[PDB]
Amino acid sequence: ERLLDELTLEGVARYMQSERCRRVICLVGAGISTSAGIPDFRSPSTGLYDNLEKYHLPYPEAIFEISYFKKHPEPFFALAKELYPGQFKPTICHYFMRLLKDKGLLLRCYTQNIDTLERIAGLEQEDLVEAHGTFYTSHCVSASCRHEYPLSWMKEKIFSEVTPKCEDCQSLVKPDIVFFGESLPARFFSCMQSDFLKVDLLLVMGTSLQVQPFASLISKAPLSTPRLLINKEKAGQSDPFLGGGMDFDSKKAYRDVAWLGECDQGCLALAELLGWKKELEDLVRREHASIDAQS
Numbered sequence: 001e002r003l004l005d006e007l008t009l010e011g012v013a014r015y016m017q018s019e020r021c022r023r024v025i026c027l028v029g030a031g032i033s034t035s036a037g038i039p040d041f042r043s044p045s046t047g048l049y050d051n052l053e054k055y056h057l058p059y060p061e062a063i064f065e066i067s068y069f070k071k072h073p074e075p076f077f078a079l080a081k082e083l084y085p086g087q088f089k090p091t092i093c094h095y096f097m098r099l100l101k102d103k104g105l106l107l108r109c110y111t112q113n114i115d116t117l118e119r120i121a122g123l124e125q126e127d128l129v130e131a132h133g134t135f136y137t138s139h140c141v142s143a144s145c146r147h148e149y150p151l152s153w154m155k156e157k158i159f160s161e162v163t164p165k166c167e168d169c170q171s172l173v174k175p176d177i178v179f180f181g182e183s184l185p186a187r188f189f190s191c192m193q194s195d196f197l198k199v200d201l202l203l204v205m206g207t208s209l210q211v212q213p214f215a216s217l218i219s220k221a222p223l224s225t226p227r228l229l230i231n232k233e234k235a236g237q238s239d240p241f242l243g244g245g246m247d248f249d250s251k252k253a254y255r256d257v258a259w260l261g262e263c264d265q266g267c268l269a270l271a272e273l274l275g276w277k278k279e280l281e282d283l284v285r286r287e288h289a290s291i292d293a294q295s
């Protein structure tokens with residue numbers, strides 16, 4: 001009775017092009033941006049926080065915490081300068097999502113990433129749930145002010161090593177990323193409650209589904225909704241020690257498919273099956289050319 005004729009990428013592609021699949025939700029994480037030269041910011045093994053000792057922190061995790069930021073914002077802003085990407089070129093995976101949008105198939109992209117590449121690739125605010133926030137906008141932290149500043153303004157402050165202060169009230173201005181101690185945006189919960197009633201396919205790309213509540217999203221899909229993981233490692237299965245998890249491989253598997261490899265290569269393989277490879281190549285090459293040519 002299952003919706004996929006077989007538990008393979010080919011089965012997913014046939015399902016996507018059938019009349020049964022009209023609304024796709026993408027859940028994406030750091031694995032979709034590594035080929036753009038942006039390392040994973042939740043990983044202690046990616047060499048982003050190896051030299052925090054210059055910042056003289058009371059403990060290493062203080063730099064992620066909101067109360068420490070509001071008291072001592074300088075370490076965060078110096079780290080932001082050190083980690084600021086040298087270019088923002090979205091990957092094949094980002095542009096595959098733009099094609100889903102262009103084809104009328106994209107219900108929503110939920111991202112754990114803060115790098116803004118989804119927006120550069122042409123996903124609009126309405127299409128996006130930035131579950132961990134984003135650098136795309138920043139706000140004055142004073143509750144009576146909340147003046148919004150664009151990334152161009154925040155970048156200038158970061159690179160000139162001037163602690164960003166609100167022009168209206170002189171309070172700190174903070175990028176709209178979710179620090180430890182802050183709540184996830186209300187938009188995440190609002191959109192989840194509606195979108196998961198409407199989803200025909202979950203495309204899970206570049207996330208190991210380990211950080212909550214973003215990981216628990218997969219259990220919100222209807223039981224029939226196929227779920228395709230494109231990721232370097234299998235993820236989302238039930239923990240044998242702790243315990244709607246992914247079932248790729250048992251005799252009871254019926255809807256979950258794992259494609260294990262680089263996110264770009266998986267999206268390229270899917271686009272090829274769909275007949276979209278030329279469209280995707282042309283889109284990526286033209287957008288990359290435009291980005292390379294920024295003068």
Ligand SMILES: Cc1cc(C)nc(SCC(=O)Nc2ncc(Cc3cccc4ccccc34)s2)n1
Pocket residue numbers: 038039040041063064065076079080081083084085114115116132135136151177178179180
């Ligand atoms: C600086 C910058 C600007 C843009 C547009 N894009 C990027 S992507 C590269 C990168 O990994 N950056 C990073 N900046 C800060 C990082 C750690 C961090 C520390 C404290 C709180 C966090 C709260 C939430 C999330 C992270 C937080 S990682 N980075």
Ligand SMILES: [Cl-]
Pocket residue numbers: 029207208209210211
């Ligand atoms: Cl993760």
Ligand SMILES: [Zn+2]
Pocket residue numbers: 140141142145146147166167168169170171
């Ligand atoms: Zn202000």
